[PDB]
Amino acid sequence: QLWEDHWIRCSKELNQWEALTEYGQSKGHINPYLVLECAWRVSNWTAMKEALVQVEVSCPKEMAWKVNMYRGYLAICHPEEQQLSFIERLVEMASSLAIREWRR
Amino acid sequence: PKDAQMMAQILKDMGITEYEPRVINQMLEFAFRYVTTILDDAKIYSSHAKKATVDADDVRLAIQCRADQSFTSPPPRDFLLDIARQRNQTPLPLIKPYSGPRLPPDRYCLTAPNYRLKS
Amino acid sequence: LTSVVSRRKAYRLRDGHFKYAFGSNVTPQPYLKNSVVAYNNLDDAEQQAALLL
Amino acid sequence: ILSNFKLRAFLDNKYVVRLQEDSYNYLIRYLQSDNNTALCKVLTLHIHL
Amino acid sequence: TKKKLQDLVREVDPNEQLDEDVEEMLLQIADDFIESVVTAACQLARHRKSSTLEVKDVQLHLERQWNMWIPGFG
Amino acid sequence: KRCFKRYSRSSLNRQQDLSHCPPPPQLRLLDFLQKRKER
Amino acid sequence: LVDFLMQLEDYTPTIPDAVTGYYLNRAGFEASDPRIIRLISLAAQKFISDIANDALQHCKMKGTAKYTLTMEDLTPALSEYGINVKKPHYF
Amino acid sequence: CHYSGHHPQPASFCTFGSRQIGRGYYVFDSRWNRLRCALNLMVE
């Protein structure tokens, strides 16, 4: 898994985000967090709306602030229509939780 | 009490002249349990035989199954010979006289303390 | 293979004769009072794994 | 080899080595490694220890 | 090819190793198990009406001595 | 006596058995590499 | 609340230590400390009490359509554990 | 439960797996199938 993790890290910094985007919907090794990291710089916006249910319910070791930050990508850039009325709640919760982990 | 005399005679035929009065009843119970079990095995074979009456061949198969699993006997005269044949090529270690009766190496002995418990 | 492994590794029984764990040391030591209250009792998922492992 | 009258007797004879048991135990350790069956053929045929 | 001996070990215990000389013994155990079952099945096959067939139904009646039940049709 | 058995003509279970074998689940990038090359 | 140490004191054994201790001597144990030989007696009690409770259930559903134990209350209770006992009642 | 000079034969023994080949040699139910065919259809 160290080889896989470093290969992902090396490919991310070599501007190969499209390859990792297609890697997230293979037959197995379903990794929704990898898709959320790589799919916001391309036109593939349908994957994000699907890979949020298992992201939120998994509660992966106090990882709520980054998911809240990732919620703004769909809110700010929505294809059909978005009310953009709860952006203030998103930033306030993200800032409060970021400061909360700063004290830790 | 006709079974008591023949059972004593059977023990007498094997060179035993002193016994206890309770073993004779035990063998009678063993004989009763043996036939009762094998009759039940005949019933299930006869019931599986889709026949009303009980045939005699079902008993032969039933006693055959009883001897297959419920009785133990070593393989005689042929299997143990192969064991000696496949081990006949094993050599013998040399005799090195240092102090006489040495012992198997350390670890492969009943001298080992539990890992968890300590001082 | 189940018989052989069972003589070398630990396991736990669920509702009788069922062997499922065949794994780590989640079984506590019964001479500890902390294990007794834990036995009587039976983010959040990781701490429970710590209580066993 | 057959016409040399000296190497023919060389093939039909064995080279005896008088070594200790530890040296043979050192040899018995090496011969079990990978790619040693061909070398073991000479030992079982040409050399008597 | 497929399912030689190692994947069956993973089927029970993920982290378990077997010695090289143990694998052949298990195959011989299976080899003896195969012969014992088929010989007993053929004996029951010749018992139905002196011979009928190798029947899956009578195999279920045979497995009572092995204390096992196949999840098959029956 | 044991290692000679794995060297004396045992390649039928080594170079023919082990070919076209599915990769273990620990290495899940080789399948992605093969798919990229094929496509 | 309280650890198992004094809970082991609370139990009142029925089988004396001279019976369980003799069993360990047969198998090759010293049987010279009080503390290990109480679970075997408790385990023996649990094994017999379960059969005793099972026999009580059979006896109280005999013919209701003082308490005497017969073979009719013993051969079905021993059947689940694998004990097959069949004694002739005559001759 | 009888007494007689002859040994009572059950004729239903444990039937250990063994077949008679050559009237002196015995096989444990396998590993002598193809070879027996090879040396019986050729030699004789």
Chain A interface residues (partner F, CB cutoff 8 A): 1, 3-4, 7, 19, 23, 26-29
Q: What three-state secondary structure class fits H19? A: strand
Q: Residue type for B39, please?
A: L
Domain boundaries, chain E: 1-74
CB pairs under 8 A between C and E: 12
Q: Output the CA–CA distances (angstroms, integers) from residue B37 to A35, B44, B70, C35, G91, in the order listed.
A: 68, 11, 12, 49, 19
Q: What is the resolution of this structure in A?
A: 3.7
Closest CA to A75 of A59, A61, A63, A93: A93
Q: Is A24 exposed, middle or buried (0-12, 13-18, 19+ CB in 10 A)?
A: buried
Q: Output the CA–CA distances (angstroms, integers) from residue C30 to A77, C27, C42, G3, in the order listed.
A: 57, 9, 14, 9
Pairing of strands H19-21, H25-27: antiparallel
A22: contact with C, CB 8 A cutoff: no
- Say which experimental method was used: cryo-EM
Spatial distance between the Cα atoms of B107 and A69, rounded to a whole number of angstroms: 60
Spatial distance between the Cα atoms of A82 and A75, rounded to a whole number of angstroms: 6
D32: contact with F, CB 8 A cutoff: yes
Q: Which residues of H touch B64 (CB under 8 A)?
A: 12, 15
Q: What three-state secondary structure class fits D15? A: strand
Contact A28 F32 (CB under 8 A): no
Domain boundaries, chain B: 1-119
Q: Which helix (H) or strand (E) element contains residue F14? A: none
Q: What is the DSSP string of G24-76?
A: HHHHT-----TTTTTHHHHHHHHHHHHHHHHHHHHHTTSS-------GGGTTT
Q: Which residues of E touch B69 (CB under 8 A)?
A: 65
CB A86 within 8 A of CB A95: no
Q: Kindly state the tokens that stand for G79.
A: 């059947």
CB G30 within 8 A of CB G39: no
Q: Kindly state the tokens that stand for B4.
A: 């008591």
Q: Residue type for H2, please?
A: H
Query: Chains that contact G by 3+ CB pairs under 8 Å?
Result: B, C
Contact C5 E12 (CB under 8 A): yes
CB E74 within 8 A of CB E61: no
Min Cα distance F17 → chain E (Å) is 6
CB D39 within 8 A of CB D31: yes
Q: Which residues pair with E20 in a beta bridge?
A: none
Q: What three-state secondary structure class fits C2? A: helix
How many other β-carbons are positioned within 10 Å of the β-carbon of residue A79?
10
Nearest to F32 among A1, A3, A23 (CB): A23
CB pairs under 8 A between C and G: 11
Q: Which residues of B touch G85 (CB under 8 A)?
A: 33
